[PDB]
Design a protein around this ligand. Structure first.
Ligand SMILES: [Mg+2]
Ligand SMILES: [Mg+2]
Ligand SMILES: [Mg+2]
Ligand SMILES: [Mg+2]
Ligand SMILES: [Mg+2]
Ligand SMILES: [Mg+2]
Ligand SMILES: [Mg+2]
Ligand SMILES: [Mg+2]
Ligand SMILES: [Mg+2]
Ligand SMILES: [Mg+2]
Ligand SMILES: [Mg+2]
Ligand SMILES: [Mg+2]
Ligand SMILES: [Mg+2]
Ligand SMILES: [Mg+2]
Ligand SMILES: [Mg+2]
Ligand SMILES: [Mg+2]
Ligand SMILES: [Mg+2]
Ligand SMILES: [Mg+2]
Ligand SMILES: [Mg+2]
Ligand SMILES: [Mg+2]
Ligand SMILES: [Mg+2]
Ligand SMILES: [Mg+2]
Ligand SMILES: [Mg+2]
Ligand SMILES: [Mg+2]
Ligand SMILES: [Mg+2]
Ligand SMILES: [Mg+2]
Ligand SMILES: [Mg+2]
Ligand SMILES: [Mg+2]
Ligand SMILES: [Mg+2]
Ligand SMILES: [Mg+2]
Ligand SMILES: [Mg+2]
Ligand SMILES: [Mg+2]
Ligand SMILES: [Mg+2]
Ligand SMILES: [Mg+2]
Ligand SMILES: [Mg+2]
Ligand SMILES: [Mg+2]
Ligand SMILES: [Mg+2]
Ligand SMILES: [Mg+2]
Ligand SMILES: [Mg+2]
Ligand SMILES: [Mg+2]
Ligand SMILES: [Mg+2]
Ligand SMILES: [Mg+2]
Ligand SMILES: [Mg+2]
Ligand SMILES: [Mg+2]
Ligand SMILES: [Mg+2]
Ligand SMILES: [Mg+2]
Ligand SMILES: [Mg+2]
Ligand SMILES: [Mg+2]
Ligand SMILES: [Mg+2]
Ligand SMILES: [Mg+2]
Ligand SMILES: [Mg+2]
Lengths: 205, 80, 85, 61, 82
RNA sequence: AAAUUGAAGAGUUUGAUCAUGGCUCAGAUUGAACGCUGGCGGCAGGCCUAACACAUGCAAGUCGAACGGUAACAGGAAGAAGCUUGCUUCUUUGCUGACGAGUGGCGGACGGGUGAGUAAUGUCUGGGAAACUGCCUGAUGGAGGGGGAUAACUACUGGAAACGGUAGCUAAUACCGCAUAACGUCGCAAGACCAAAGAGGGGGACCUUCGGGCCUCUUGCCAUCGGAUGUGCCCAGAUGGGAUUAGCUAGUAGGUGGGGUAACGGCUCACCUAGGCGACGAUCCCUAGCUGGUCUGAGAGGAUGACCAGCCACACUGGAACUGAGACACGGUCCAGACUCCUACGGGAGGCAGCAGUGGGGAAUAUUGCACAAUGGGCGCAAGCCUGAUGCAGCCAUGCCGCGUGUAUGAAGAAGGCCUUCGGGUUGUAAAGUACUUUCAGCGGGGAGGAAGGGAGUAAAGUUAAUACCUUUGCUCAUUGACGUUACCCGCAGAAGAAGCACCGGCUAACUCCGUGCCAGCAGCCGCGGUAAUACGGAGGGUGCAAGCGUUAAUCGGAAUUACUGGGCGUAAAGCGCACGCAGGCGGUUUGUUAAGUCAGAUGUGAAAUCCCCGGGCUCAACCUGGGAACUGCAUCUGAUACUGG
C-alpha cells in the first residue's frame, strides 16, 4: 500500500524534482538528474502519446504517493463533482491528510508526513486520525498530539518548511504545532508543471 | 364516463355474440412509426341487431362465457 | 407422521372426516328427496318436503360445514323450482 | 479434442489426467487448447526462472 | 393482523430498525403496506435518533393495526420526549 | 436551487495509395476457476454441474387461566421406630406448586429451500366485479334449557415389529338436538328457518349441603353490518427464437335449460346453432422461471436475472381428496412406482431442492459451531417455552475499500553483479553507517454501546356497594449478552515479523549482453527462429500493477461490423427479368365540425432496496442511513386546435 523503493529513481525518471527529499542538500547534487535512470539512461526518444499521458499521470501519482485504484477513485469522484474536472482532482489530492501535514510542514517530506500521520500523532479537531488518506474539510483545525509534541524531527521539519516557501490556503502557528485548513485551494495556488488535461484524457480513454 | 371503446364488426354468424375489431393507434416502441394493431373482442349482444360493418361502442362486463366479456352500450353506422 | 402434532392432526382429521361425511350425506339425501318430489310434480308434498329440508341445511350452514351462499343458492334454487312447479 | 502442450519439454504420457484451458495456437491446424502446465499431473518446466506462473514453477531460493 | 413493527436493516454489530406497518404473516424484511419511521439504536449525541409519524401510526391503530413491544416503548418514549 | 459534466483509437490485404471489408488488441465487470505469491482489518459473497443419492444430530410447537386426571418431582399433612419426642424418615391424600401421557383450542397453508416445469393458467403495468376473509379492530344486540357418547385408565387380546381389536368405564370451551331471532338467509311479499361456553381473579351483604348459588372486574363464545389486511377471478397492453412448422379446433365458438363453485364462466352435463382461432404468425418444435434490477453503453440499446425484495411453480416420481378461515398441504393422510433399510418371510418403514455434513459428479464453492441477549414469528391473560428464521462466531486474497513492510541523514558515488569505445557507466542515496518513530501482528491493563424491557413491592386515578381484584401512570430494589480475551483508549520493547507477479519487436510504458541455430520454442494479431535473435531460454537494467499479479472462460464496448438515433446498392456483397394488382404504407388544395393521434395542467399510480442530488454516522473509505427528484410508463379528469386522422 506504498512504494518503498529508491525515491530518486522516480525523481530522475520524470526528470522534474518531485519534492521527494528534504532540501538540506541539493537534489541535483544528490542524484545524477541529467540522465534517465537505468542502464540506457542517456537515451531520450520522441516520447509517444501513451508515454506522455502516462508520464503526467505517474508524475502526479508519485508526487502524492497515491496508488492506482485510489487514484482512479479520486478521478471518479473528481469527474462526479461539480465544476472543472482537473481542478477537482487536484482539490481532492490536496485535501488528502498527509498532503495537508506536508503543506503545514509538520513532517519533512510527504513520506515522512505519511509516517507521522500513520503512527498516531495528528489531531484533527482534537481527534486522533490513524490514516494518511483522511479528507480534510474547510474551517478545520489540525494539530499534533502531546506525545508527539516533543519529537525533534517535527521542529527540524518546521525549520525546513519555513526555509521553504509557504502554502497560501492554510493557517499555521508552529509554536502550538497546529493550524487550520482555511479554504479548499484553487488551481492557481498550486504548481503549473502539474498538467491536468492529460490525466483526464488518460482516465477517459 | 364509463371506460368504453369503439370498433368495427368483422362477423356475426353465431348467435347473441359479435366479434369487434378495435383498431387502436399505438406508437412503435423502437422505430417511432405509429403502426396500427386491430384487436378482436368477442362482444355480447341481445337480439342480434348488428352485422358486418357496424361501428359499436362497447364496455366490459362480467364474463358472459369462456372468451366473451364485453357488452355494447350504443350502436352507430349500422349499414355498409 | 414424524411430529407428534402431525400424528395428532391425522387422528383428529379422520374423526372429523367420519363425522362430516355423516353430516354431508344427511344434507345430500334431504336435498335429493325434495328434488325427487319436485320432478314428481306433486306440489303439496314437495313444499312439505322443502319445509322438511330447510332447517337442516340451515343448521349445517350455521355450523359452517358448508357456506352461507351455498345454502342460500340451494334455497333459492328449490324455491324457483317450486314456483315453476 | 487434441490440445497443444506448452513449455520447453514435458513429461506427459497417456493414462494421465490433465487440464486444458483454451486459446488457439495459430500455426497448428486444428488445435484450439493449451494444457495448464503445473496442473494436477503435468509438472512445470525444469529450471525456468522467469514467467514462472504461466508454466507452474515454484520460487527459487 | 397488520402490525407496526421493526425491521433490522443495517450491518454487523450496528443495527438500524425501520418501523413498518406490515402484515403479521410476512417476513421481517418482507413486504409492508406503509413505512412510517425509524429508530437508530447507536445514534450518537447532538443528533436525531428516532423519528415516527404519529399521524399515520395513530391512523393505523384506529384502523385496527396492533402494536409491537419495542415500538410501544418507543412511542411512549417519543410522547415522553414531548 | 441541484439530481448531472457526454463519445479516443491501433495493427493487418498492397511494390505503394485510397476505399469497401472482415480478423485481433487496448476498457469495465464477474457467483468465477487455475498458476506463482501470501501481513492485518472493515463490509459483503460462497455447489452456476446431477431437480444425483443420503449416514448422523437438530429445523414446530404451545396452553393446567378448556378438561378429566397423576407418569416422575417438591411443599403440606396423618401413623411408628433405635426415638436424633423431634425428627433421617416409610405409606395414604391432586390438597397445593406443577406435569410425562391423553381429549380439546390455536399453530403445522407463516418463516426457510430450489428453479426442474411453464413462451403463457405465469410475470409487469393500468383498469373491473360476480366474491370469500381465522387472528386484529368499530358498532348493534344475545349468551337459557338439556342429552348421548368417546379417548386417558381397567381387564382380555392379535402382532416379531409398526399397528391394532374386544368388553367396561369418565369429563370439557369436544359432539348433538331443544328454547330463542333481528336490520340475518329464501321469497316481491305474507310468511318460513337459523346460534352459543365458559374460565380466572377477589370478596362487602343474603348465604352453601362448605363443592358454594350471589356481587364485582378481566378475558373468552354466538348472530349481523362494517373497516383494514390477505386470497380467489376477469379484461387490455407488453413479455424468446423459427415459417426448412399453414392450417388448427368435437366440449371445440356461442345459445337455452339443469347441476356445481366462496364467486362469473363449457366449470360441468342435455339439446340446438356451426362456429371460433390464422400471415397483426394460429398450430407445431427447441430453449426459458418473470419482475424491481445488475453489468456495459455518452445515449438509444445489448447481455443477464448471483446476493437483496415482490410474484409464480415444486417438495423422491405420477395422481386423488380430507381436515381447515387458508392446502388439493416441504418436515400431514391415502394409492401406484424405482431406490435404500428392518423382518420371526406374514409383513413393515423412509424421502435434506430446511441447517450442518457425507458419498458421487465437477475446473469449482465452507463448521455434523454458540445463543434466543436483539428483531420478528407460534402458543400463552402472562411469566415462559419452541424458534438451523435471525444475531454472531469458523473457513476461503471471491470482490470492494483501508492500512502496514519504516522515516531522515548518508558519496568512501564502498564492495559485489552486469555492461563497456577498457576513460568508465550502471546497480545507486540504493545498501553499510548514525539519528528519530512504533501504525498493524505480539505482550499487559481499562473498557463503552448494542438493554429496551421483565420481576417484586409502594403512591395516584379509573372502575367498583368496595380503600379488594385488574388496567394505566410514576416511584426504590437486585437485575437479563452467544458475540467478548468486544469497538475503542492507555502502557511495554525493538526496525524487528511482514513484496510479489506480468511484461520489455509494433500495437503497448519498458534494452543490452550471453546460450543457441527453421532446432528448442514463443504467439492476442502482424509474424519471429536458417551463426551478431532488442520477438525463443538466462542474466543485468527497466516499465506497469501491488497483497495481489496474470492465463482462461463469459458479456458489453471499440463494432457506424444489423445503422431508430446511426450504414449501403453502376464497378467493392447488394435493384426482383419486366409489368398488372388485392391487403398494407403514404397521400394535392379550401372551408366547417369532431377531437382519435399530438401537446399542456391536475389526479391516481409507478412497492421498498438499488441508480443519482444534497445531507448524517462507522476516526477515513467500502458500508449503513435521512430528505429529494427520477421511477423516461399506464389510466382518469380537464383543456388547446397548428399538423395527422375521421
Ligand atoms: Mg488495497
Ligand atoms: Mg469537472
Ligand atoms: Mg404411516
Ligand atoms: Mg481496419
Ligand atoms: Mg507486404
Ligand atoms: Mg494458496
Ligand atoms: Mg435429491
Ligand atoms: Mg435416518
Ligand atoms: Mg401435559
Ligand atoms: Mg389451524
Ligand atoms: Mg428453468
Ligand atoms: Mg361446542
Ligand atoms: Mg335451534
Ligand atoms: Mg349454463
Ligand atoms: Mg345457474
Ligand atoms: Mg456503442
Ligand atoms: Mg403445491
Ligand atoms: Mg406428492
Ligand atoms: Mg373445508
Ligand atoms: Mg372447528
Ligand atoms: Mg407441512
Ligand atoms: Mg425434509
Ligand atoms: Mg445443505
Ligand atoms: Mg467429493
Ligand atoms: Mg473429484
Ligand atoms: Mg470438513
Ligand atoms: Mg427471541
Ligand atoms: Mg426444539
Ligand atoms: Mg480478507
Ligand atoms: Mg565495480
Ligand atoms: Mg493493538
Ligand atoms: Mg450494556
Ligand atoms: Mg441506551
Ligand atoms: Mg514477462
Ligand atoms: Mg515503446
Ligand atoms: Mg514470453
Ligand atoms: Mg542464415
Ligand atoms: Mg546470439
Ligand atoms: Mg512479446
Ligand atoms: Mg452496435
Ligand atoms: Mg468482440
Ligand atoms: Mg458499409
Ligand atoms: Mg465482379
Ligand atoms: Mg457486384
Ligand atoms: Mg432492372
Ligand atoms: Mg405498378
Ligand atoms: Mg393530406
Ligand atoms: Mg383527443
Ligand atoms: Mg422503489
Ligand atoms: Mg462521512
Ligand atoms: Mg382535423
Amino acid at each position: 500500500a506504498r512504494y518503498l523503493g529508491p525515491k530518486l529513481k522516480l525523481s530522475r525518471r520524470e526528470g522534474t524534482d518531485l519534492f521527494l527529499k528534504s532540501g538540506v542538500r541539493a537534489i541535483d547534487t544528490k542524484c545524477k538528474i541529467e540522465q534517465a535512470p537505468g542502464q540506457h539512461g542517456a537515451r531520450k526518444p520522441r516520447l509517444s502519446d501513451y508515454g506522455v499521458q502516462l508520464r503526467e499521470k505517474q508524475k502526479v501519482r508519485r508526487i502524492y504517493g497515491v496508488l492506482e485504484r485510489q487514484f482512479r477513485n479520486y478521478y471518479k469522484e473528481a469527474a462526479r463533482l461539480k465544476g472543472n474536472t482537473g481542478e477537482n482532482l487536484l482539490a481532492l489530492l490536496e485535501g488528502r491528510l498527509d498532503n495537508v501535514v506536508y503543506r503545514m510542514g509538520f513532517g519533512a517530506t510527504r513520506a515522512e508526513a505519511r509516517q507521522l500521520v500513520s503512527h498516531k500523532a495528528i489531531m484533527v479537531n482534537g481527534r486522533v486520525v490513524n490514516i494518511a488518506s483522511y479528507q480534510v474539510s474547510p474551517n478545520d483545525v489540525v494539530s499534533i498530539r502531546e506525545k508527539a509534541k516533543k519529537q525533534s524531527r517535527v521542529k527540524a521539519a518546521l525549520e525546513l518548511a519555513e526555509q521553504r516557501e509557504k502554502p497560501t490556503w492554510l493557517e499555521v502557528d508552529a509554536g502550538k504545532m497546529e493550524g487550520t485548513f482555511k479554504r479548499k485551494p484553487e488551481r492557481s495556488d498550486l504548481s503549473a508543471d502539474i498538467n491536468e488535461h492529460l490525466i483526464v484524457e488518460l482516465y477517459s480513454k | 364516463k364509463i371506460r368504453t371503446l369503439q370498433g368495427r364488426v368483422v362477423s356475426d354468424k353465431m348467435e347473441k355474440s359479435i366479434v369487434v375489431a378495435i383498431e387502436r393507434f399505438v406508437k412503435h416502441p423502437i422505430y417511432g412509426k405509429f403502426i396500427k394493431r386491430t384487436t378482436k373482442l368477442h362482444v355480447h349482444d341481445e337480439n342480434n341487431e348488428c352485422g358486418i360493418g357496424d361501428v359499436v361502442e362497447i364496455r366490459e362486463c362480467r364474463p358472459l362465457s369462456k372468451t366473451k366479456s364485453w357488452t355494447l352500450v350504443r350502436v352507430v353506422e349500422k349499414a355498409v | 407422521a414424524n411430529i407428534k402434532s402431525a400424528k395428532k392432526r391425522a387422528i383428529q382429521s379422520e374423526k372429523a372426516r367420519k363425522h362430516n361425511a355423516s353430516r354431508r350425506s344427511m344434507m345430500r339425501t334431504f336435498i335429493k328427496k325434495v328434488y325427487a318430489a319436485i320432478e314428481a310434480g306433486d306440489k303439496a308434498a314437495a313444499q312439505k318436503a322443502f319445509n322438511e329440508m330447510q332447517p337442516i341445511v340451515d343448521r349445517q350452514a350455521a355450523k359452517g360445514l358448508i357456506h352461507k351462499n351455498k345454502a342460500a343458492r340451494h334455497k333459492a334454487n328449490l324455491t324457483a323450482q317450486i314456483n315453476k312447479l | 479434442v487434441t490440445s497443444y502442450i506448452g513449455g520447453e519439454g514435458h513429461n506427459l504420457q497417456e493414462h494421465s489426467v490433465i487440464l486444458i484451458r483454451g486459446g488457439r495456437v495459430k500455426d497448428l491446424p486444428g488445435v484450439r487448447y493449451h494444457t495448464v502446465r503445473g496442473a494436477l499431473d503435468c509438472s512445470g518446466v525444469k529450471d525456468r526462472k522467469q514467467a514462472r506462473s504461466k508454466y507452474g514453477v515454484k520460487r527459487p531460493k | 393482523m397488520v402490525t407496526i413493527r421493526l425491521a433490522r436493516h443495517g450491518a454487523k454489530k450496528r443495527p438500524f430498525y425501520q418501523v413498518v406497518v406490515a402484515d403479521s404473516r410476512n417476513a421481517r424484511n418482507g413486504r409492508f403496506i406503509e413505512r412510517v419511521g425509524f429508530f437508530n439504536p447507536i445514534a450518537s449525541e447532538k443528533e436525531e435518533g428516532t423519528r415516527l409519524d404519529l399521524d399515520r401510526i395513530a391512523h393505523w391503530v384506529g384502523q385496527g393495526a396492533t402494536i409491537s413491544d419495542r415500538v410501544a416503548a418507543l412511542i411512549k418514549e417519543v410522547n415522553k420526549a414531548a
